[PDB]
Amino acid sequence: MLPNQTIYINNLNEKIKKEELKKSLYAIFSQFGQILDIVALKTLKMRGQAFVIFKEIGSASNALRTMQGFPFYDKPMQIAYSKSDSDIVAKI
């Protein structure tokens, strides 16, 4: 799976309000480089999931390799590169 600028995260703690979850994701991912956006909706389709869109592909790679399994709100994050441009959109 080729690297791309967006990482897809699941196994996120669903008890956390989305505004807070997004701020906390920025807190931990901003070290990897400039973040263009973080998406985490309170829809059934997006339960436990988020996308972090980095400016640079290399930042997404370093984020993925460093934070894989990191216990965030006491739950290990599962991180993958996004599979395609149509992916976020499908999740809305």
Numbering used by the authors: 3 to 94
What does the paper say about this structure?
The U1A/U2B″/SNF family of RBPs is found in the U1 and/or U2 small nuclear ribonucleoprotein (snRNP) components of the spliceosome. Jawed vertebrates use U1A to bind stem-loop II of U1 snRNA (U1SLII) and U2B″ in conjunction with the leucine-rich repeat (LRR) protein U2A′ to bind SLIV of U2 snRNA (U2SLIV). Both U1A and U2B″ employ an N-terminal RNA recognition motif (RRM) to specifically recognize their RNA targets. Here, we report crystal structures of four states of dSNFRRM1 at 2 Å resolution or better: the free dSNFRRM1 (residues 1–96; dSNF1–96), dSNF1–96–dU1SLII, dU2A′–dSNF1–96, and dU2A′–dSNF1–96–dU2SLIV. Altogether with the characterization of dSNFRRM1 dynamics alone and in complexes by NMR spectroscopy and targeted mutagenesis combined with binding studies, we delineated how the intrinsic dSNFRRM1 RNA-binding capacity and specificity are fine-tuned by networks of intra-molecular interactions that modulate dSNFRRM1 dynamics, and how the auxiliary dU2A′ protein can capitalize on intrinsic dSNFRRM1 flexibility to gear dSNFRRM1 binding specifically to dU2SLIV.
We determined a crystal structure of dSNFRRM1 based on a construct containing residues 1–96 of dSNF (dSNF1–96) at 1.49 Å resolution, showing that the protein adopts a classic RRM fold, with Tyr10-Gln51-Phe53 displayed on the surface of its four-stranded anti-parallel β-sheet, in agreement with the previous NMR structure of dSNFRRM1 19. Comparison of the six crystallographically independent dSNF1–96 molecules indicated intrinsic conformational flexibility in the RNA-binding surface of dSNF1–96, predominantly affecting loop L3 (residues 42–51; Cα root-mean-square deviation (rmsd) 0.16–1.10 Å with a maximum displacement of 1.47 Å) and to a lesser extent L1 (residues 13–19; rmsd 0.10–0.14 Å with a maximum displacement of 0.21 Å), as well as side chain conformations in the Tyr-Gln-Phe motif. Furthermore, the conformations and positions of the N-terminal extensions (residues 1–7), which in one case forms an additional α-helix, and the C-terminal loops L6 (residues 84–87) and α3 helices (residues 88–94) differ among the six dSNF1–96 copies, in agreement with solution NMR data showing that the latter element undergoes extensive ps-ns motions.Fig. 1 dSNF1-96 structure and conformational flexibility. a Sequence alignment of dSNFRRM1, hU1ARRM1 and hU2B″RRM1. Truncating α3 at residue 96 causes the C-terminal region of the corresponding construct to become more flexible on the ns-ps and ms timescales as the helical structure is disrupted, consistent with three copies of dSNF1–96 in the crystal structure entirely lacking electron density for the α3 region. Only α2 residues exhibited no measurable exchange.
